[PDB]
């Protein structure tokens, strides 16, 4: 108002023009900015969304997604213009070494594990999983039987009970 | 890369700055926008990369079934820790002006020789460890062993590969012989990240084109303004040269943020593949390979990464 | 140079890391012409 | 070709733990021209470093510097080269495996933004 | 879409596409990126289909 109380409107237009342009300037500035922090805002509550609805909905089997190591449950909590999620998962502890063999060979025969480790302490052989350590005896029916004893490698003679 | 906003909007004269100082505001935000996207590019390769906090290295024989692997692990007697695949990589990818204007480049924190190291890290701890080091202690895991326990993930039952691992051995042998030659007869492919270093490296060469301008004004360089005309009236060029390089300045900012955004979102899909298709079989369809997948293998390469997907598909069929 | 890290923070405390200042802007030392030699010994003399 | 400029940084640690600083020339070369010295002067690969003392050991990174390069505080300011991590080798054979025993588990977070202020 | 710079900036009149000579160098990058649009929606339909 000091350039209007002060100058002559021929010469406001000469004065006042540019202060129009450089605030349009700003405003630009300002909205352009805005839109380009809103577009990652939303790419980021999309995958929040999405960690929602797999994460917590369900148990995921994507690796690494739903926290650090195998993924067992997840729980959400509210926050200040944001969420927060807490992954409970699980972990081994301690391990130990073991000989293994691809097949066991019986009466001539190749045997493969139904699901399993074929694994030995030096004397027996057992068969486990691969996430724990419960040694079983071997028999009929935790393994099945498909072809010969001489087209693979790493065979072992070892003996199945039957029931 | 990082500027100076008054070198380029400027010469040697003061003022100039001083009728900089009546805008003030400008090259502030930009410098805080320049050196955010600054780090935010050197915090790009970090989750990408290091993903393990426990470097591993390969044992010296290599009684892997059959399977060759001299091609992906880095070679001794190379100077460079590198691999043949990265070499070529290195060759088929191919400036002091432009650092002497007031544009600076900013060398990354990371090396190419420690992501090697990384990469090589990788490599060893999926050949020997299986998938159960990307949880938490590394097991090591007989390489048939996984190759069967893969074969198990597909619905395929473990004796086929015990069956047929002599074809399978030389199939895989086969195909890895054959990737060196498929890169190397066209360069096409590699273009996918040639884009990324020439349309930044225009990026400069239009905007230091741009000092030589007549924006309205007599003449671009500035001191024969001053040693020609008289100083009350040298203001109506040096303010319309000055808004004039401010624009440019503005544009580049914001084309730079362009190209960072869907740069960042480029490298969260390129981790998401590293979490996945790397340390895990996912059983997602096409999206590690074409067909039912089976592994993966990570490769450095100038300013991005490339995967090898092994991946198996059915060949004759019959009807019944 | 923590001063004026405190000065461009516009703060007192200071965290850590990196941070940015101004240039360095090695100066000139001085000035040197060079023009081409020679008057072609124009023939003042003569004249006079 | 034209004398090179610089652009000046800040190594310091938390005010709260003391003051003593270290500076940072970016791209000017020492091997010169920089006025004058203090405590020691490096030449790395970013640039010109001063007030702080390179080591040969290799420790994590807190303050980063560029090319592989970090500094940290023991009295004094010291500057080093990247240790990735502790190296590890492990055994492979044609007949060994790793059977876990025991386990644990554990919680993490993750804070996600999900919309800003209107 | 494509747009032409010179026709829709100044019309049938020589001196105000010699005037546009005086910024010179900017045309060519509207004509880049709305090219580089135009491939890149014309391509989004052969991963998508």
Request: glycine fraction near 6%; aromatic fraction near 10%.
């Amino acid at each position: 108002n000091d350039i209007l109380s002060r100058l002559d409107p021929p010469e406001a237009e000469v004065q006042i023009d540019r202060l129009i342009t450089g605030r349009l300037q700003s405003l630009q500035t300002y909205v352009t900015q805005q839109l380009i922090r809103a577009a990652e805002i939303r790419a980021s509550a999309n995958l929040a969304a999405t960690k929602m609805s797999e994460c917590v909905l369900g148990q995921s089997k994507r690796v690494d997604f739903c926290g650090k190591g195998y993924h067992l449950m997840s729980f959400p909590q509210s926050a200040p213009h944001g969420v927060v999620f807490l992954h409970v998962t699980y972990v081994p502890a301690q391990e130990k070494n073991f000989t293994t063999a691809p097949a066991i060979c019986h009466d001539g025969k190749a045997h493969f594990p139904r699901e399993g480790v074929f694994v030995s302490n030096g004397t027996h052989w057992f068969v486990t999983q691969r996430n724990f350590y419960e040694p079983q005896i071997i028999t009929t029916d935790n393994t099945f039987v498909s072809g010969n004893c001489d087209v693979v490698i790493g065979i072992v003679n070892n003996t199945v009970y039957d029931p | 890369t990082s500027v100076d906003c008054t070198m380029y909007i400027c010469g040697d004269s003061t003022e100039c700055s001083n009728l900089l100082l009546q805008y003030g505001s400008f090259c502030t935000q930009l410098k805080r926008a320049l050196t955010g996207i600054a780090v935010e590019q050197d915090k790009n390769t970090q989750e990408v990369f290091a993903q393990v906090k426990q470097i591993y290295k390969t044992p010296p024989i290599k009684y892997f079934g059959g399977f060759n692997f001299s091609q992906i692990l880095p070679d001794p007697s190379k100077p460079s820790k590198r691999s043949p695949i990265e070499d070529l990589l290195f060759n088929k990818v191919t400036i002091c002006a432009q650092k002497f204007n007031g544009l600076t480049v900013l060398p990354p924190l990371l090396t190419d020789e420690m992501i090697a190291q990384y990469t090589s890290a990788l490599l060893a701890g999926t050949i020997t460890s299986g998938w159960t080091f990307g949880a938490g202690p590394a097991l090591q895991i007989p390489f048939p062993m996984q190759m069967a326990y893969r074969f198990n993930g597909i619905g395929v039952t473990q004796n086929v590969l015990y069956e047929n691992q002599k074809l399978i051995a030389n199939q895989f042998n086969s195909a890895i012989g054959k990737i060196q030659d498929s890169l190397s007869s066209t360069p096409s492919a590699l273009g996918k990240l040639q884009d990324v270093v020439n349309h930044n490296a225009q990026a400069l060469n239009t905007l230091v084109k741009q000092l030589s301008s007549k924006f309205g004004a007599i003449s671009s360089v500035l001191n024969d303004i001053l040693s020609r005309l008289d100083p009350p009236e040298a203001e109506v060029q040096i303010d319309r040269l000055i808004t004039g390089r401010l624009q440019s300045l503005q544009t580049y900012v914001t084309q730079q943020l362009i190209r960072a955004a869907e740069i960042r979102a480029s490298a969260n899909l390129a981790a998401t593949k590293m979490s996945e298709c790397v340390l895990g079989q996912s059983k997602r369809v096409d999206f590690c390979g074409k067909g039912y997948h089976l592994m993966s293998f990570p490769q450095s390469a100038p300013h991005g990464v490339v995967f090898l997907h092994v991946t198996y598909v059915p060949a004759q069929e019959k009807n019944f | 140079p923590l001063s004026e890290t405190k000065c461009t923070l516009k703060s007192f405390t200071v965290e850590k890391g990196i941070y940015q200042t101004s240039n360095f802007r090695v100066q000139p030392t001085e000035s040197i012409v060079r023009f081409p030699n020679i008057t072609n010994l124009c023939p003042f003399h003569e004249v006079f | 070709t034209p004398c090179s400029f610089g652009g000046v940084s800040v190594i310091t640690p938390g005010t709260n733990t003391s003051n003593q600083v270290a500076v940072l020339y970016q791209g000017v070369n020492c091997t010169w021209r920089v006025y004058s010295t203090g405590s020691n002067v490096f030449q790395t690969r970013a640039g010109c470093l001063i007030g702080a003392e390179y080591v040969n050991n290799s420790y994590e990174c807190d303050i980063p510097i560029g090319a592989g390069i970090c500094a940290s505080y023991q009295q004094s300011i010291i500057a080093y080269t990247m240790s990735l991590g502790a190296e590890n080798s492990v055994a492979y054979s044609n007949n060994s495996i790793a059977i876990p025993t025991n386990f644990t588990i554990s919680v993490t977070t993750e804070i996600l933004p999900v919309s800003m202020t209107k």
